[PDB]
DNA sequence: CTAATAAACTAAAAACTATTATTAT
DNA sequence: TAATAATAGTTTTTAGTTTATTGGG
């Protein structure tokens, strides 16, 4: 695919352009999946991720009751996403 | 030492980003 | 429909939500109809591996264990799931202090 | 290497720093407070790994283990934190200095020897790998203890003691209506103009600095082989690394503690927990999918041991410079395992610079990784006006594409234009020429990320505006050119064709 | 003997932060270890209930992320190792509570470390 | 009538200390 | 009879997915 756009010079000068990726380190589209040693299918396999309050004796944490944060100074400041 | 970051030893001083100055 | 003889209860605590709903749909499909633990008619209680009797009591707000309800782990029911017929709860019963 | 760093800040408690010759001007106390907050936040952004402290003296109260009078520490040597920033912030302003004078003492006599002693003591109270010394001070008086010459003698004695114990100090000019007049008591007890003014290096402190400046660290310890047995100690570095936003720190809703992550796989039909051994790599090509395990997948990925084997020599002009794949790397000679490798490095760089030929070399960065072909681009050592290097010596690392990496392009022909137009925009570019410098273009988007971050951290009244430099000042160029753009439009474009569709 | 005073001080030595308190803790623990390392016939009996109360204290209080408590944790695990190796099988009453405390330590917030 | 893809995202491995068992007698 | 040599434990890149984000037909 290409990039159809417009060159910009100041405000009064512009040229429509179609940029193309000349050289790219191509990567295979296909990646290895995970299958059972016996079922040999992804259907039996069910990976999941668990979040729980490690401090308060592994108390389960809702996937919507979870917030990001950032280490500001010698501390992590609470901070949301939206 | 001149030319070095007074706030950071072992590192040079950095002049603020200026952008452009046409001739 | 070999599980239609099971009126058990599933606990969200200690059980993954996807795991919990998978167990729910599996037991409903095979005829097993769930009932509340604090209510009667509980054949088994689906809890995690490391559940404690008093911890379960304070989790479900039960002063005493429900009648006929066995504090069994998910391993036994999963087992019965792959070989399609029931197994005894031996090796899956959590001790109840008096 | 050099480990943690310590920066210590000293301000006398006296009414001189609470007052100014012009009340429009800041008080020395208030300007020092705002400057120290600025450098604190700059260090938090930049190199928060190090250690900082806050300590006062000359007050009506003292806080220190030594119990020296009027010597009041405020923050000990610790990595800076937002609570420290705010607890030093409320004392800024007129009301801040008023509440400071209220709850905190201000204006008394003391000794410089005792404050030096306690600051050295608290510096010693750190059990970290120290890197450098920085003990800042702030005073508008050059003779604070000339009343007692014995106090001056013991002060210079303790200064000699610190400089013997590998401690380094520094002095900041504060505004003096009579002139600060250095060398009256300094330039001999410490390690020019009398400086009625104060700005000597504070202006470098007030300007916002936002970076990470990764310390001196080797990218990889690598062993180079020429044919089969020539062993060379080489060290790979990078002069550039892509700067990224710090990762989000996932944490709880209410308590906001960082929740740990548990990841597991369990059966669907069985419902029971799966095992890592049961995991098998699978891909579906055609009708018959492929069953595989991971370990042999990286074994297939495993080709050769890490190392750089010389694949020959090619002049620098033969390679087409537009062929790049990655930020270029930079190698430096080493003498850690192999002794004398630097002699070889010098000889080869001299010979290749004489012969202006690159050195093609097969590249293997890490074990069980696919090898690659790189050419060695020599680099000289260039000094500045003060003979400080601006171009490091050694070798650049260029990356050559494979056949498949070159994407096919749609056919393009050669089209000629009038040389009149060529000279026209030659004049245009000559109108708007300048010289590129690498220290003037940052990512203002990351800067705005940080800006919002301190805005939320310190509850700043406004989200600090990112001073973007990527936007052109279109009005200036349009003013400079004006009637040349439409001249181009008439010369080249038909006078009925808009550039838009 | 003095181990009562020492346990009282250690229970009183974790009020503030001031990780020098942890240094006092580790030095102290060294002294109680060597004092009870070689009892004759008697001090072991008091040392058993001292271990009881100390395990209680480290379970209920030394249950946080402070490294001044972490170093105490490793040193007292080694210390209990050498006492139980010396004391043999005579700590049967404390076995199940030691197991509960040790399982808690594995499930402790130190699991991030 | 169905896409590379930029950014986000987690994973994985090296580098630099980093004391800590470890033989000799 | 009692030493010193391997030697893990934090940052920090970086590949490895993943995604949610367009117009393609």
Q: What is the dihedral of CA A33, A35, A40, A43, to 10 degrees?
A: -100
Residues D45 and D155 in one domain: yes
What is the spatial distance between Cα D101 and Cα D74, in angstroms, rounded to a whole number?
A: 15
Residues D194 and D252 in one domain: no
Do residue D216 and residue B11 have CB atoms under 8 angstroms apart?
no
**CATH for D448:** 1.10.1600.10
What is the spatial distance between Cα E113 and Cα E111, in angstroms, rounded to a whole number?
A: 5
> DSSP letter string over D159-182?
HHHHHHTT--B--EE---TT---T
Angle separating helix axes D474-481 and D419-431, nearest 10 degrees? 130
Residues D449 and D471 in one domain: yes
- Which chain C positions have a beta carbon within 8 Å of D269's beta carbon? 81-82
Q: Is the dihedral of CA D43, D44, D49, D55 positive or negative?
A: positive
What is the spatial distance between Cα D183 and Cα D190, in angstroms, rounded to a whole number?
A: 10
- Residue D308, φ and ψ in degrees, nearest 5: -120, 110
Residues D380 and D493 in one domain: no
**Closest by CA position to C97, among listed C71, C61, C59, C75:** C71
- Residue D341, φ and ψ in degrees, nearest 5: -65, -30
B2, B4, B6, B18: best to mutate for the D interface, most D CBs within 10 A? B6
Asked if residue D351 keeps its beta carbon closer than 7 A to nucleic acid strand F, the reply is no
Do residue A55 and residue E107 have CB atoms under 8 angstroms apart?
no
Per the CB < 8 A criterion, the answer to whether C68 and D258 are in contact is: no
Residues D371 and D236 in one domain: yes
Residues D281 and D338 in one domain: no
Encoding tokens for residue D397?
A: 């690392």
Residues D141 and D196 in one domain: yes
Residues D114 and D162 in one domain: yes
Residue finishing a domain among D304, D321, D344: D304
> DSSP letter string over D419-482?
HHHHHHHHHHHHHT-----GGG---HHHHHHHHHHHHHHTT-SS-PPP---SS--HHHHHHHHS
| Nearest Cβ partner for D388 among B3, B8, B14 | B3
How many residues can be counted in chain C?
Answer: 98
Asked if residue D250 keeps its beta carbon closer than 7 A to nucleic acid strand F, the reply is yes
**Which H/E stretch holds residue D383?**
strand D382-383
E111 shares contact with chain A (CB less than 8 Å): yes
E113 shares contact with chain A (CB less than 8 Å): no
Angle separating helix axes E20-37 and E3-11, nearest 10 degrees? 160
Q: How many CB pairs lie under 8 A apart between chains B and D?
A: 61
**CATH for D392:** 2.40.290.10
Residue finishing a domain among D373, D402, D431: D402
Residues D144 and D266 in one domain: no
Per-window interface: A 26-65 vs E, CB < 8 A: 54-55, 57-58
Encoding tokens for residue D245?
A: 């936003």
Cβ-based neighbours of A35, under 8 Å, separated by 6 or more: A41, A42, A45, D280, D282, D291
Strands A33-35 and C70-73: unpaired
Number of neighbours of residue D62 by Cβ within 10 angstroms: 19
Number of neighbours of residue D135 by Cβ within 10 angstroms: 20
Query: Which residue of D lies nearest to B14 if distances are taken between CA atoms?
Result: D439
Residues D188 and D278 in one domain: no
Cβ-based neighbours of D64, under 8 Å, separated by 6 or more: D71, D72, D73, D118, D122
Encoding tokens for residue D305?
A: 């041991």
Look at chain D and report how many structural domains it folds into.
4
C13 shares contact with chain A (CB less than 8 Å): yes
Asked if residue D406 keeps its beta carbon closer than 7 A to nucleic acid strand F, the reply is no
Residues D396 and D408 in one domain: no
Angle separating helix axes E95-107 and E43-60, nearest 10 degrees? 30
Q: How was this structure determined?
A: cryo-EM
Angle separating helix axes E67-87 and E20-37, nearest 10 degrees? 0
Domain that holds residue D369: 214-241+305-402
Nucleotide nearest to D49 (CA to C1'): G11
Residue finishing a domain among D402, D419, D444: D402
Q: What is the dihedral of CA E66, E72, E77, E81, to 10 degrees?
A: 180
What is the spatial distance between Cα D34 and Cα D54, in angstroms, rounded to a whole number?
A: 14
**Which H/E stretch holds residue E97?**
helix E95-107
E100, E109, E110: best to mutate for the A interface, most A CBs within 10 A? E109
Longest Cα separation, chain C: 37
Q: Is the dihedral of CA E80, E85, E91, E96 positive or negative?
A: positive
Q: Which nucleotides of F are covered by protein (CB under 7 A)?
A: 3-5, 8-11, 13-18
Q: D34 in the Ramachandran plot: left (φ > 0), alpha (ψ -120 to 50) or beta?
A: alpha
> DSSP letter string over D49-95?
TSEEEEEEESSSS-BSTT--TTEEEEEEEE--BHHHHHHHHTT-HHH
Do residue D269 and residue C81 have CB atoms under 8 angstroms apart?
yes
Asked if residue D129 keeps its beta carbon closer than 7 A to nucleic acid strand F, the reply is yes
Residues D264 and D118 in one domain: no
What is the spatial distance between Cα D438 and Cα D436, in angstroms, rounded to a whole number?
A: 7
Resolution to 1 decimal place, in Å: 4.2
Cβ-based neighbours of D353, under 8 Å, separated by 6 or more: D378, D380
Angstrom distances, CA of residue E24 to CA of D341, D437, E80: 51, 57, 19
- Residue D10, φ and ψ in degrees, nearest 5: -125, 130
């Amino acid at each position: 695919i290409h990039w159809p756009c417009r060159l910009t010079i100041g405000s009064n000068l512009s040229i429509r352009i179609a940029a193309y990726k000349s050289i790219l380190q191509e990567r295979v589209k296909k990646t290895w999946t995970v299958v059972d040693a016996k079922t040999l299918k992804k259907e039996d396999i069910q990976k999941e991720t668990v979040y729980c309050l490690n401090d308060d004796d592994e108390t389960e944490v809702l996937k919507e009751d979870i917030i990001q944060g950032f280490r500001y100074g010698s501390d992590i400041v609470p901070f949301s996403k939206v | 030492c001149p030319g070095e970051s007074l706030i950071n030893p072992g590192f040079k001083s950095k002049k603020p980003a200026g952008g452009v100055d046409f001739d | 429909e070999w599980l239609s003889s099971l009126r058990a209860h599933v606990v969200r605590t200690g059980i993954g939500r996807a795991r919990a709903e998978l167990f729910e749909k599996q037991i409903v499909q095979h005829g097993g109809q769930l009932c509340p633990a604090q209510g009667p008619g509980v054949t088994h209680i689906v809890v995690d591996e490391g559940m404690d009797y008093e911890r379960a009591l304070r989790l479900l707000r039960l002063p005493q264990l429900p009648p006929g309800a066995q504090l069994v782990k998910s391993a036994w029911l999963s087992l019965c799931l792959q070989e399609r017929r029931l197994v005894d709860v031996a090796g899956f019963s959590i001790f109840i202090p008096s | 290497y050099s480990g943690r760093d310590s920066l210590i800040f000293l301000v006398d408690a006296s009414k001189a720093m609470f007052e100014s010759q012009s009340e429009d001007e800041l008080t020395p106390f208030d300007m020092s407070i705002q400057c120290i907050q600025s450098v604190y936040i700059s260090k938090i952004i930049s190199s928060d790994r190090d250690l900082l402290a806050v300590v006062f003296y000359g007050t009506e109260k003292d806080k220190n283990s030594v119990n020296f009078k009027n010597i009041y520490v405020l923050q000990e040597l610790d990595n800076p934190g937002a609570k420290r920033i705010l607890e030093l912030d409320q004392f800024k302003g007129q009301q801040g200095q008023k509440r400071f004078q209220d709850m905190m003492g201000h204006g008394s006599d003391y000794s410089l020897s005792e404050v030096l002693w306690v600051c050295a003591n608290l510096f010693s109270d750190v059990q970290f790998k120290m890197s450098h010394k920085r003990i800042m001070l702030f005073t508008n008086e050059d003779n604070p203890h000339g009343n007692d010459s014995a106090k001056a003698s013991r002060a210079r004695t303790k200064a000699g003691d610190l400089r013997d114990t590998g401690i380094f100090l520094d002095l900041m000019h504060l505004k003096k209506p009579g002139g600060f007049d250095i060398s009256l008591f300094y330039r001999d007890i410490i390690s020019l103009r009398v400086h009625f003014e104060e700005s000597s290096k504070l202006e470098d402190l007030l300007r916002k600095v936002r970076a990470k400046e990764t310390r001196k660290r080797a990218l990889s310890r690598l062993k180079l082989k020429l044919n089969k047995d020539i062993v060379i100690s080489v060290g790979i570095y990078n002069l550039v690394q892509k700067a990224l936003k710090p990762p989000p720190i996932k944490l709880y809703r209410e308590t906001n503690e960082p929740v740990k992550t548990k990841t597991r796989t369990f059966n669907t039909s069985t419902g029971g927990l799966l095992l890592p051994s049961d995991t098998k790599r699978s891909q579906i090509y055609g009708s018959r999918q492929i069953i595989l395990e991971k370990e042999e997948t990286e074994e297939l990925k495993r080709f050769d041991d890490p190392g750089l084997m010389l694949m020959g020599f090619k002049p620098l002009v033969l390679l087409k410079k537009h062929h790049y794949l990655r930020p270029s790397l930079f190698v430096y000679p080493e003498e850690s395992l192999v002794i004398g490798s630097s002699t070889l490095f010098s000889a080869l760089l001299i010979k290749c610079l004489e012969k202006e030929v690159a050195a093609l070399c097969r590249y293997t960065p890490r074990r069980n990784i696919p090898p690659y072909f790189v050419a060695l681009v020599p680099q000289e050592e260039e000094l500045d006006d003060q003979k400080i290097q601006v171009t490091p010596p050694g070798f650049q690392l260029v990356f050559l594409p494979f056949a498949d990496d070159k994407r096919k392009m749609p056919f393009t022909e050669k089209i000629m234009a009038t040389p009149e137009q060529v000279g026209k925009m030659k004049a245009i570019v000559e109108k708007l020429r300048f010289t590129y410098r690498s220290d003037s273009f940052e990512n203002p988007v990351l800067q705005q990320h940080f800006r919002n971050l301190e805005a939320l951290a310190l509850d700043l009244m406004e989200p600090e505006q990112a001073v973007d430099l990527t936007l052109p000042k279109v009005e200036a160029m349009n003013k400079r050119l004006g009637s040349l753009v439409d001249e181009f439009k008439e010369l080249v474009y038909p006078p009925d064709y808009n550039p838009e569709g | 003997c003095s181990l009562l005073r020492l346990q009282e001080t250690l229970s009183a030595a974790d009020r503030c932060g001031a990780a020098l308190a942890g240094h006092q803790l580790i030095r102290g623990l060294g002294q109680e270890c060597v004092l009870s390392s070689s009892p004759a016939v008697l001090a072991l009996q008091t040392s058993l209930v001292f271990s009881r109360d100390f395990g209680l204290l480290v379970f209920v209080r030394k249950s946080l992320n402070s490294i001044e408590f972490r170093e105490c944790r490793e040193e007292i695990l080694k210390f209990l190792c050498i006492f139980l190796e010396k004391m043999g099988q005579k700590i049967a009453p404390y076995s199940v509570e030691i197991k509960n405390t040790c399982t808690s330590v594995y499930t402790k917030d130190r699991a991030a470390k």
